[PDB]
Design an enzyme around this catalytic site. Structure first.
Site, PDB file in Angstrom:
ATOM      1  N   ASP A  39      21.489   7.886 -16.556  1.00  0.00           N
ATOM      2  CA  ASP A  39      20.920   6.714 -17.129  1.00  0.00           C
ATOM      3  C   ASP A  39      20.077   6.831 -18.190  1.00  0.00           C
ATOM      4  O   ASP A  39      20.331   7.572 -19.045  1.00  0.00           O
ATOM      5  CB  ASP A  39      19.909   6.466 -15.661  1.00  0.00           C
ATOM      6  N   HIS A  56      14.528   2.700 -15.621  1.00  0.00           N
ATOM      7  CA  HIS A  56      15.265   2.614 -14.530  1.00  0.00           C
ATOM      8  C   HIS A  56      15.652   4.037 -14.173  1.00  0.00           C
ATOM      9  O   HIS A  56      16.202   4.370 -13.026  1.00  0.00           O
ATOM     10  CB  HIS A  56      16.232   1.526 -14.743  1.00  0.00           C
ATOM     11  N   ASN A  64      25.736  -6.872 -10.618  1.00  0.00           N
ATOM     12  CA  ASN A  64      24.878  -8.080 -10.245  1.00  0.00           C
ATOM     13  C   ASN A  64      25.539  -9.503 -10.456  1.00  0.00           C
ATOM     14  O   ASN A  64      24.663 -10.211 -11.084  1.00  0.00           O
ATOM     15  CB  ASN A  64      23.582  -7.932 -10.510  1.00  0.00           C
ATOM     16  N   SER A  67      21.868  -1.662  -8.870  1.00  0.00           N
ATOM     17  CA  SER A  67      21.451  -0.447  -9.496  1.00  0.00           C
ATOM     18  C   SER A  67      20.268   0.425  -8.638  1.00  0.00           C
ATOM     19  O   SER A  67      20.285   1.431  -9.027  1.00  0.00           O
ATOM     20  CB  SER A  67      20.747  -0.748 -10.797  1.00  0.00           C
TER      21      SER A  67
END
Ligand SMILES: [Ca+2]
Ligand SMILES: [Ca+2]
Length: 275
Positions: free
Chosen positions: A32, A64, A155, A221
């Site tokens: 990430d 994130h 998404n 996520s």
């Protein structure tokens, strides 16, 4: 005071904790935007950066990577939140910059690092509508090497009868993770398709943020790290199980929630999975 986010309970992680299993000795790569390794509710063991513009994997400009890390393994103590696997060994594998973006070459270098450093679990809360053969190769290699790989489904919501599952979630080798809310309804944004494998809580997920704070985010996520964390819990209870056994249990013991196009096998239940 420490809070246990609803998602941690929803997947039945506390059942494992009550058994004395919290992910100890299990190596989880957070692939990430980095992890803020100074967060009082996190402990980071190692890592590396493959982002040309950002040399330090232990600084997170996106937020994130740090958030995902907290869902996986926020420490059990008197503060903040609690991870699915609060004793797990976190590695900050930085392949996304502070905009949450990265080249497949960088991502691939990160997966390669996870392999050569013998990670047990990879979390990839990242996705795009397309991938590449080089990406497929390294992902498949990680899994064949013995690593559990969880990837966010995407998404993109639904689109009639077509798959909206992104990559690398689309590759059969990864566990593609969709998002439900606390009611076990699929979130309206959750990607769908035959590639979908399991669901996890992905609505208003409270976790760690860089700088020592906490906050909530919506998305697959955020569902993904519940599955990454569950895999670590299972491995800590069953250290001799392969990634294939771990994935099989996660899917086979899932709580049926509806048609697989939308829900896959349904909601993970780590208590049942580790039984
Ligand atoms: Ca805590
Ligand atoms: Ca997959």
């Amino acid at each position: 005071a420490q809070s246990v986010p609803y998602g941690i309970s929803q997947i039945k992680a506390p059942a494992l904790h009550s058994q004395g299993y919290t992910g100890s000795n299990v190596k989880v790569a957070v692939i990430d935007s980095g992890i803020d390794s100074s967060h009082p509710d996190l402990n980071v063991r190692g890592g590396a950066s493959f982002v040309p513009s950002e040399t330090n994997p232990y600084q997170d400009g996106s937020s994130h990577g740090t958030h995902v890390a907290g869902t996986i393994a926020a420490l059990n103590n008197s503060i903040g939140v609690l991870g699915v696997a609060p004793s797990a060994s976190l590695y900050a594998v930085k392949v996304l910059d502070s905009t949450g973006s990265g080249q497949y070459s960088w991502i691939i270098n990160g997966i390669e690092w996870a392999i050569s450093n013998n990670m047990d679990v990879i979390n990839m809360s990242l996705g795009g509508p397309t991938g590449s053969t080089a990406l497929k190769t390294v992902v498949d290699k990680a899994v064949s090497s013995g690593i559990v790989v969880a990837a966010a489904a995407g998404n993109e919501g639904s689109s009639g009868s077509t798959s909206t599952v992104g990559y690398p979630a689309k590759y059969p080798s990864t566990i593609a993770v969709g998002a439900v809310n606390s009611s076990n309804q699929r979130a309206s944004f959750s990607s769908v398709g035959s590639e979908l494998d399991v669901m996890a809580p992905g609505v208003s997920i409270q976790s760690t943020l860089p700088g020592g704070t906490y906050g909530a985010y919506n998305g697959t996520s955020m569902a993904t790290p519940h599955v990454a964390g569950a895999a670590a819990l299972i491995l800590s209870k069953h250290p001799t199980w392969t990634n294939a056994q771990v994935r099989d249990r996660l899917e086979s013991t899932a709580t049926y929630l509806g048609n697989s196009f939308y829900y896959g096998k349904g909601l993970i239940n780590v208590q049942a999975a580790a039984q």
